[PDB]
Amino acid sequence: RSFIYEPFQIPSGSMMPTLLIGDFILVEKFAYGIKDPIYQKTLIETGHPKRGDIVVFKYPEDPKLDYIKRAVGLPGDKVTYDPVSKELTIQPGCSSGQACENALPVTYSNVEPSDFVQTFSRRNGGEATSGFFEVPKNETKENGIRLSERKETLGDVTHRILTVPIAQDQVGMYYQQPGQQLATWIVPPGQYFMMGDNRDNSADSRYWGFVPEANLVGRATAIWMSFDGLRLSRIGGIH
Numbered sequence: 001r002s003f004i005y006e007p008f009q010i011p012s013g014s015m016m017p018t019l020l021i022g023d024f025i026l027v028e029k030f031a032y033g034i035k036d037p038i039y040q041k042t043l044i045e046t047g048h049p050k051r052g053d054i055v056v057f058k059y060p061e062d063p064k065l066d067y068i069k070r071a072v073g074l075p076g077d078k079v080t081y082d083p084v085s086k087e088l089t090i091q092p093g094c095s096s097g098q099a100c101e102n103a104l105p106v107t108y109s110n111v112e113p114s115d116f117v118q119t120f121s122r123r124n125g126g127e128a129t130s131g132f133f134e135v136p137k138n139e140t141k142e143n144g145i146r147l148s149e150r151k152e153t154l155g156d157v158t159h160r161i162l163t164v165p166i167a168q169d170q171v172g173m174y175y176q177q178p179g180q181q182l183a184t185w186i187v188p189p190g191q192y193f194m195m196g197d198n199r200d201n202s203a204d205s206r207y208w209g210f211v212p213e214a215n216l217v218g219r220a221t222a223i224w225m226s227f228d229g230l231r232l233s234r235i236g237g238i239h
């Protein structure tokens with residue numbers, strides 16, 4: 001088993017608080033080679049993402065670019081997102097579109113304030129981000145809103161998500177899958193529904209649709225370095 005590992009820079013905030021601007025991750029590629037006993041042939045197996053894995057993939061709207069999101073929907077999944085509660089419902093194997101009762105348990109913790117504040121640049125009567133500031137919970141920041149935090153359990157994978165208390169998704173700017181209602185998608189075979197942990201600051205599958213299996217690059221396994229000063233506390237596993 002010969003696994004290829006590649007380094008990626010995280011320049012965006014779409015995966016906060018799990019991945020921050022300045023994190024340098026390691027990605028394990030899904031395609032790996034296995035040679036014959038001595039020398040005869042070489043088999044190349046392609047691993048599949050598990051629900052909740054942090055996956056790097058070639059952007060469907062521009063395959064020259066790599067994007068990183070969490071694979072929340074797998075083939076056959078009926079993915080439903082409530083833009084108001086900012087919570088997901090996953091019903092696996094419901095590709096036919098029937099009244100199935102084998103729903104995946106997606107549970108959420110109590111909401112609490114995060115270690116991050118988001119500031120907005122006044123563009124002559126508007127609000128567009130300039131960056132995400134790490135501010136002590138008892139302290140505050142000018143023109144900045146303190147983001148919320150809660151844990152999300154995708155069946156057997158628990159991770160953290162960030163939410164902006166004032167912002168809510170514009171469901172009219174969402175990708176609408178033909179035949180399905182708004183904020184409801186059934187993942188077709190060989191496709192993946194990707195979402196960012198910074199739920200209100202992530203251009204993901206809600207907006208540009210499913211990711212084909214051929215577009216997948218690999219799984220994020222570690223943070224091997226992080227700059228802001230060095231964030232030595234962040235080197236290690238990705239939780």
Ligand SMILES: *C(=N)CNC(=O)[C@@H]1Cc2ccc(OCCN)c(c2)-c2cc(ccc2OCCN)[C@H](N(C)C(=O)[C@H](CCN)NC(=O)c2cnc(-c3ccc(C(C)(C)C)cc3)nc2C)C(=O)N[C@@H](C)C(=O)N1
Binds near residue numbers: 010012
């Ligand atoms: C959702 N919306 C979240 N967004 C993403 O997922 C982004 C989307 C995106 C869009 C555009 C864009 O750049 C446009 C500029 N033309 C980026 C991301 C982007 C992506 C990256 C870096 C910058 C960047 O934009 C900057 C402009 N603001 C990274 N990226 C390109 C890499 O990580 C590359 C990959 C090469 N295919 N890796 C490296 O450049 C790299 C090379 N070598 C090393 C390295 C490390 C150590 C060593 C030693 C052995 C120690 C010596 C040697 C060599 N390290 C690195 C990191 C990117 O593609 N990231 C994706 C996941 C991303 O963030 N997309």
